[PDB]
Amino acid sequence: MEFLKRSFAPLTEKQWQEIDNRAREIFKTQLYGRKFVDVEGPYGWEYAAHPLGEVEVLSDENEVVKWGLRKSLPLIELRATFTLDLWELDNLERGKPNVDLSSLEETVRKVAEFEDEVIFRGCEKSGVKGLLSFEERKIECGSTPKDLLEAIVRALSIFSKDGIEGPYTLVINTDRWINFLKEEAGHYPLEKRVEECLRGGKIITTPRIEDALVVSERGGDFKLILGQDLSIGYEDREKDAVRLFITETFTFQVVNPEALILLKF
Amino acid sequence: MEFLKRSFAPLTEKQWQEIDNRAREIFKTQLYGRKFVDVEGPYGWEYAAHPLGEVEVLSDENEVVKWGLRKSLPLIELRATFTLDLWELDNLERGKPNVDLSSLEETVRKVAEFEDEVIFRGCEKSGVKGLLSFEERKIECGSTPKDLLEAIVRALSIFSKDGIEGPYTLVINTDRWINFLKEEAGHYPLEKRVEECLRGGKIITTPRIEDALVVSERGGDFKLILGQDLSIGYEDREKDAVRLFITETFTFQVVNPEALILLKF
Amino acid sequence: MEFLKRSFAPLTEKQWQEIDNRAREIFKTQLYGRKFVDVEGPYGWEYAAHPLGEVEVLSDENEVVKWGLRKSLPLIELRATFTLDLWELDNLERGKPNVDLSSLEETVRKVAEFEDEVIFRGCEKSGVKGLLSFEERKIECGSTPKDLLEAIVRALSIFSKDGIEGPYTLVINTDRWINFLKEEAGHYPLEKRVEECLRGGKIITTPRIEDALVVSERGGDFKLILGQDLSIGYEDREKDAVRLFITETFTFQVVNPEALILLKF
Numbered sequence: 001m002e003f004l005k006r007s008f009a010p011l012t013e014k015q016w017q018e019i020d021n022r023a024r025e026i027f028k029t030q031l032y033g034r035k036f037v038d039v040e041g042p043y044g045w046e047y048a049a050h051p052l053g054e055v056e057v058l059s060d061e062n063e064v065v066k067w068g069l070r071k072s073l074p075l076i077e078l079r080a081t082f083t084l085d086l087w088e089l090d091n092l093e094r095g096k097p098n099v100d101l102s103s104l105e106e107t108v109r110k111v112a113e114f115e116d117e118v119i120f121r122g123c124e125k126s127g128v129k130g131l132l133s134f135e136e137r138k139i140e141c142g143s144t145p146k147d148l149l150e151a152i153v154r155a156l157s158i159f160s161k162d163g164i165e166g167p168y169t170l171v172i173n174t175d176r177w178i179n180f181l182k183e184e185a186g187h188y189p190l191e192k193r194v195e196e197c198l199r200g201g202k203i204i205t206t207p208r209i210e211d212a213l214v215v216s217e218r219g220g221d222f223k224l225i226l227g228q229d230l231s232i233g234y235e236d237r238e239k240d241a242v243r244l245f246i247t248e249t250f251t252f253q254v255v256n257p258e259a260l261i262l263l264k265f
Numbered sequence: 266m267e268f269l270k271r272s273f274a275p276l277t278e279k280q281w282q283e284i285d286n287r288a289r290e291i292f293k294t295q296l297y298g299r300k301f302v303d304v305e306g307p308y309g310w311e312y313a314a315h316p317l318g319e320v321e322v323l324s325d326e327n328e329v330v331k332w333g334l335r336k337s338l339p340l341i342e343l344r345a346t347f348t349l350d351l352w353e354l355d356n357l358e359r360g361k362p363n364v365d366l367s368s369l370e371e372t373v374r375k376v377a378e379f380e381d382e383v384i385f386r387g388c389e390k391s392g393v394k395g396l397l398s399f400e401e402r403k404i405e406c407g408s409t410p411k412d413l414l415e416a417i418v419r420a421l422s423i424f425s426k427d428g429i430e431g432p433y434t435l436v437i438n439t440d441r442w443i444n445f446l447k448e449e450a451g452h453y454p455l456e457k458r459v460e461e462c463l464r465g466g467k468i469i470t471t472p473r474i475e476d477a478l479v480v481s482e483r484g485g486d487f488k489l490i491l492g493q494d495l496s497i498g499y500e501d502r503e504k505d506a507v508r509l510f511i512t513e514t515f516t517f518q519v520v521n522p523e524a525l526i527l528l529k530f
Numbered sequence: 531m532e533f534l535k536r537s538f539a540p541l542t543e544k545q546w547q548e549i550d551n552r553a554r555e556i557f558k559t560q561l562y563g564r565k566f567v568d569v570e571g572p573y574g575w576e577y578a579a580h581p582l583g584e585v586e587v588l589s590d591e592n593e594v595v596k597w598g599l600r601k602s603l604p605l606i607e608l609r610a611t612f613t614l615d616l617w618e619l620d621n622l623e624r625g626k627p628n629v630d631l632s633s634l635e636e637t638v639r640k641v642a643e644f645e646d647e648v649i650f651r652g653c654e655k656s657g658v659k660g661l662l663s664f665e666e667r668k669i670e671c672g673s674t675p676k677d678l679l680e681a682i683v684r685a686l687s688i689f690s691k692d693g694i695e696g697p698y699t700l701v702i703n704t705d706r707w708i709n710f711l712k713e714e715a716g717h718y719p720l721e722k723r724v725e726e727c728l729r730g731g732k733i734i735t736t737p738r739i740e741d742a743l744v745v746s747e748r749g750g751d752f753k754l755i756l757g758q759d760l761s762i763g764y765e766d767r768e769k770d771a772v773r774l775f776i777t778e779t780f781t782f783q784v785v786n787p788e789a790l791i792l793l794k795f
Contacts, residue, residue: 048335051313053626055342058390064372065345065379069391070313070514070624072339077320080330107329114330125323126334146715150708157704157735161639163556187717196721249335255627266543268623273540311625501767 003045004233015089022101023108027230030112032206033119036169038219041226049074050225050251073251075227076126081235081245082107111246116208119252134257141265145184152197155214155261162258164216168198172212174205212263221259226250268310269498276507280354287366288373292495295377297471298384301434303484306491314339315490315516338516340492341391346500346510347372376511381473384517399522406530410449417462420479420526427523429481433463437477439470477528486524491515533575534763545619552631553638557760560642562736563649566699568749571756579604580755580781603781605757606656611765611775612637641776646738649782664787671795675714682727685744685791692788694746698728702742704735742793751789756780
């Protein structure tokens with residue numbers, strides 16, 4: 001019996017595992033950040049903040065004793081609720097393989113969008129700096145696949161200058177990738193061209209961002225620390241419906257900004 | 266070779282251990298809080314903050330996802346420097362058992378006073394609430410030892426009402442204790458009277474406070490968490506003098522305010 | 531305890547290994563010559579000069595005794611200094627994974643540029659002849675990738691005439707390679723065309739040179755002799771900063787000029 005109080009929910013364990021695998025299957029495809037960022041944890045529920053190794057001196061200079069405070073990044077706890085119908089769920093025990101989980105799917109989609117937004121554009125309230133906030137690592141790129149290849153080559157040259165090794169992955173907005181395919185009446189399979197230019201790299205198309213960027217996957221550059229992973233608990237029961245929730249405690253850190261390059265095409 | 270960089274200091278290990286035992290001997294008598302408060306740690310240098318188990322909801326009520334932040338108490342790092350004379354220290358190897366350590370003694374006294382002040386009256390900058398801030402647990406007491414005994418009995422009655430068991434310790438200002446002894450021309454050894462009234466309790470006289478209070482020593486009521494205990498490191502060398510420093514990372518927490526009673530005599 | 535006097539530096543071994551791996555990682559990408567030239571050594575610090583096997587006759591012809599001197603190539607010793615901040619470094623022990631090493635990176639970049647310049651264009655003061663000094667091995671090439679392929683084929687024909695076997699590597703300036711890609715709207719992946727024409731060869735893009743050339747990697751044609759490899763030592767300490775230096779003793783020799791072909795495109 002854990003934090004989630006799963007036992008007290010008046011639902012069959014078959015429905016429990018069904019919802020579990022449904023949520024996990026949705027999250028595998030909807031978690032864009034985890035596809036390429038490093039993941040650390042779980043550290044348990046008790047992990048409240050992550051140390052930063054920095055000290056700020058509140059004390060003055062005349063006083064001999066230098067007393068100050070250690071900076072740290074507090075974790076973010078998210079909790080989103082939803083409701084299900086007991087009679088609709090009952091059909092699983094009767095043998096119906098299809099059930100209505102539209103509310104659960106919508107909640108999972110929205111929470112995935114929220115966490116992707118937090119990872120990409122940051123949250124000034126929590127002090128987390130988003131990747132797009134690193135404007136200093138920008139390169140102008142033209143509207144043609146030729147200009148895209150030129151930008152990729154120049155980005156790899158900059159990476160080699162800064163000593164950033166492979167593998168390299170290109171994350172591009174899906175609409176812009178589709179537009180590039182529309183403009184590409186050439187002779188070269190665009191995927192194989194990009195892979196050859198990236199020296200065995202991979203392409204990720206996502207709608208979370210509007211532009212393209214190149215990252216390195218040597219590890220230790222983007223750490224997503226999880227206190228408690230994604231989990232579903234039971235809140236309360238009312239009439240013929242059951243209320244559940246999804247909770248997660250996490251934080252994000254960018255170790256080396258030099259491993260990220262942005263394209264302004 | 267630790268945080269303190271002790272090896273690089275051009276001082277004999279005999280002088281090192283001499284200064285170590287001198288500082289430890291001073292701290293045993295000058296650390297008033299540790300005489301009665303619970304001590305936890307060390308958690309190492311990396312322990313930046315202590316979790317509080319509380320969550321504050323930054324998110325609004327219309328948005329389904331409830332994202333918030335976990336509260337925690339950041340640790341306080343103190344660092345006080347001092348200087349010693351190489352030629353004066355050299356006499357130890359020649360056989361002189363007496364050396365001048367007045368600067369070190371003064372620094373240790375001042376840092377002990379600072380930490381006692383932080384423990385007792387708190388620090389609003391760090392968010393630590395001092396014991397004297399708990400004004401709700403106050404009892405008026407008269408100027409006579411008879412009134413002191415009456416206040417002790419009433420405080421024990423309140424403790425029994427609130428279910429606080431022994432042992433109990435009375436911490437009283439040294440000047441007020443001396444004044445009570447001056448006023449006491451009675452027939453009862455005052456120490457044995459106080460011990461009998463406290464049911465085997467003990468009395469602690471300190472100049473850090475100006476009044477008297479009664480506490481319980483059942484444990485788990487006042488936790489002083491130490492990341493790195495009191496330690497002395499070497500900063501730099503200049504001409505014929507050597508500069509050292511004393512560093513410490515700590516925090517304080519009051520678990521149960523009901524275990525503390527204050528007297529307003 | 532070596533030449534570098536690493537022990538006397540008042541820095542943690544963690545910082546030592548961090549700086550070591552940082553410098554090594556930068557050098558792996560910034561050492562263009564070692565990517566394709568043969569490397570010999572280390573011969574230790576005591577190796578002052580490399581024998582040439584040539585004797586010059588100072589004596590006249592009337593005197594029976596023929597006394598002369600043996601020619602040799604003296605080694606070059608480079609030493610570049612830089613400074614770091616002790617307080618900035620202290621954050622590593624506190625847990626900060628990010629430190630400012632901009633001065634170290636700049637020094638490593640500049641020394642890499644200097645050694646690449648010495649390897650490529652030589653140094654008349656030291657008597658080392660640069661590869662670009664071999665103007666007799668020049669071939670004119672046009673501005674089109676077709677002309678580049680023609681020049682590659684003719685260079686391979688000359689190599690076969692002179693009995694130079696594979697593998698062959700093409701080293702081309704990055705800007706000119708990018709311009710060739712810009713001009714290439716053809717149908718053939720340019721990398722695979724170059725590899726096929728070179729019979730499994732590889733392409734290296736570098737900014738150290740402005741033109742393109744073809745070399746052979748059968749070994750024994752370009753020897754870089756190292757007395758002491760790249761190393762970082764500690765010079766002295768001042769106030770709150772520490773001064774380090776990077777030192778290296780080396781020399782370069784071209785055995786067979788017939789294994790090098792230059793393109794004048």
